[PDB]
């Protein structure tokens, strides 16, 4: 979530993703902790015994066969953490994740209910206003004239500067707003 | 592989600003600036029962007796069960009992 995906997944990343998914489905089958630990050590032994492959064409073939085996032997209802997608509590508080710009449309009475918070909000707004021009200049400088471009973003590289496009990251709503 | 120095420094600065923003999300102790108990049985249930129950019961009973019973077929009830040996209040007659019950095995 906090990192952007690359153009393609390398072979090592595909193998590690398969290993983690296989362990999760193995725990979904095993339920009990001791049984899960036994069969997870067996799965780790399988991955270790196929680890040192040098041809890499046979390694891709083994990865394909292992993926076929996983799709044949996966749990129909694997365990999902509640906050994870497909879980029971996933996107539950999106109805409460109100974006911060409605305080701009708040009435002066409602602002008068919270004086100090709105003063600090104005300070954040002024900081954003200066940093926007600074970071637009930085992003224009940092952009390659031609070639390969990814979704990664530069940090602040000088004193008294903020990272570009920091507003929607820093001022995002909390995961438990209430 | 791990973080690049680029992404690591960006995440560190973004997280520090996130700490500052969440710290500023706190409330001052004056926030927000807003412009006969007895016991539960003797008082708390008493006024609720006399307000939300008794007065609506008065209004409902008034409507039932003086606006629904005054209409012909509004409140229609089935006939009561009349068993042998009973005495009718309205008529005054006692219906005869049943027969001699020849079976007395159980």
């Amino acid at each position: 979530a906090f990192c952007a995906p690359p153009a393609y997944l390398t072979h090592q990343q595909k193998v590690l993703r398969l290993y983690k998914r296989a362990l999760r489905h193995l725990e979904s089958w095993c339920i009990h902790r001791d049984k899960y630990r036994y069969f997870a050590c067996l799965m780790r032994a399988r991955f270790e015994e196929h680890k040192n492959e040098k041809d890499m064409m046979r390694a891709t073939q083994l990865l394909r066969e292992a993926e076929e085996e996983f799709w044949q032997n996966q749990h129909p209802q694997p365990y999902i953490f509640p906050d994870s997608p497909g879980g029971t509590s996933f996107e539950r508080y999106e109805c409460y994740k109100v974006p911060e710009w409605c305080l701009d449309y708040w009435h002066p009475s409602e602002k008068a209910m919270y004086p100090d918070y709105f003063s600090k909000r104005e300070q954040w707004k002024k900081l954003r206003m200066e940093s926007w021009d600074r970071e637009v200049k930085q992003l224009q400088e940092e952009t390659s004239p031609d070639g390969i471009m990814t979704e990664a973003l530069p940090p602040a590289r000088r004193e008294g500067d903020l990272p570009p496009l920091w507003w929607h990251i820093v001022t995002r709503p909390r995961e438990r707003p209430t | 592989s791990g973080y690049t120095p680029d992404e690591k420094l960006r995440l560190q600065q973004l997280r520090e600003l996130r700490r500052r923003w969440l710290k500023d999300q706190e409330l001052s102790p004056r926030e927000p600036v807003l412009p006969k108990n007895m016991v539960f049985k003797a008082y708390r249930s008493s006024l609720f029962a006399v307000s939300h129950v008794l007065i609506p019961m008065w209004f409902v009973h008034y409507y039932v007796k003086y606006h629904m019973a005054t209409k012909p077929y509004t409140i229609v009830s089935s006939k009561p069960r009349i068993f042998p040996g009973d005495t009718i209040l309205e008529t005054g007659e006692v219906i005869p009992p049943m027969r001699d019950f020849p079976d007395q095995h159980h």
Binding site: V98, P99, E100, C102, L103, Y105, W106, H107, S109, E110, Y114, Y117, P173, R174, P177, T178 | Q25, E26, L27, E31
Partner: peptide
């Protein structure tokens, strides 16, 4: 305590 501000829309109108 440690109470936090809750972002809400303009319910005033």
């Amino acid at each position: 305590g440690k109470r936090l501000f809750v972002v809400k829309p303009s319910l005033y109108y």
